């Protein structure tokens, strides 16, 4: 996270760290949506141009964390994966359309003060909150700097609030063909404020707090960008509401 700040303890209890078993390293972010399902970006698991194709046994998920590196005994939960589901229409060849994946845990996890699921949006929450200028929140353990070569690593989970950007400005900012299953967020060059997701934050949640019922809803998944914190460029997010029927089909199928 670029230009964010340290998260408070329990601030993002749905935050999940996707961790590579061997070698040991943070792969991406993800989110807890029930006691047995974790949501992430398809590119975190499958990206043929890089010969990336993780299987259930290559990874583990860590829930309830705050520190990036410490094993948080009695606080975090480490879970193994039963099965991975990649959207069948995930377009890695062109634009990362439908950049979404679900992971079923081998067994359910118990919730705690540090482990709790985020809500998926209903149509009224999407209609009301996905508006240009409205801010959502992104969290993760990714790089701290846009700049260069270390890109910086945080000691603890980072948080940043970012405004949704008008679709014509998103489209105008990139040569990639943007689809209705994606939206972009970030401050414009003349807004002065900075902040962005970066490498390592991919797959994590973009959440908004509902003014109607004060619950947190995951409206996006960190998907791709072109230079994080690079003003003039914006971060792109998978539109969770638009892909909700696929999520429900998978969950009520296994």
């Amino acid at each position: 996270i670029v230009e964010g700040s340290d998260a408070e303890i329990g601030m993002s209890p749905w935050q999940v760290m996707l961790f590579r078993k061997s070698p040991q390293e943070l792969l991406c972010g993800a989110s807890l949506i029930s006691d047995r399902w974790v949501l992430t970006a398809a590119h975190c698991l499958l990206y043929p141009p890089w010969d990336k194709n993780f299987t259930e046994n290559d990874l583990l998920v860590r829930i309830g964390k705050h520190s990036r590196t410490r094993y948080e005994r009695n606080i975090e939960k480490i879970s193994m994966l039963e099965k991975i589901y990649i959207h069948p229409r995930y377009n890695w060849r062109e634009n990362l359309d439908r950049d979404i994946a679900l992971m079923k845990l081998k067994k359910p996890v118990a919730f705690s003060d540090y482990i709790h699921p985020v809500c998926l949006p209903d149509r009224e929450t999407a209609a009301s909150l996905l508006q240009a200028g409205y801010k959502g929140r992104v969290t993760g353990w990714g790089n701290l700097k846009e700049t260069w070569t270390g890109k910086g690593q945080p000691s603890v989970l980072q948080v940043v609030n970012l405004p949704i950007v008008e679709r014509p400005v998103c489209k105008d900012s990139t040569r990639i063909r943007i689809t209705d299953n994606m939206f972009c967020a970030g401050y414009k060059p003349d807004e002065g404020k900075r902040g962005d997701a970066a490498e390592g934050d991919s797959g994590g949640p973009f959440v908004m707090k509902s003014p109607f019922n004060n619950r947190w809803y995951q409206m996006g998944i960190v998907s791709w960008g072109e230079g994080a914190d690079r003003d003039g460029k914006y971060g792109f997010y998978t539109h969770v509401f638009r892909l909700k029927k696929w999520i429900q089909k998978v969950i009520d199928q296994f």
């Binding site: 801010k135 929140r137 509902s210």
Partner: protein, 35 residues
């Protein structure tokens, strides 16, 4: 299938459930109300 969690989703044990506000959530809500 889904499992438990839907019912109480999105309400944080250390925040909403304790009537406590985190440091920057007001920035989010004011962005929906003000412009």
């Amino acid at each position: 299938t889904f499992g438990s969690g839907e019912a109480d989703c999105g309400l944080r044990p250390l925040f909403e459930k304790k009537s406590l506000e985190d440091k920057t959530e007001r920035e989010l809500l004011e962005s929906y109300i003000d412009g």
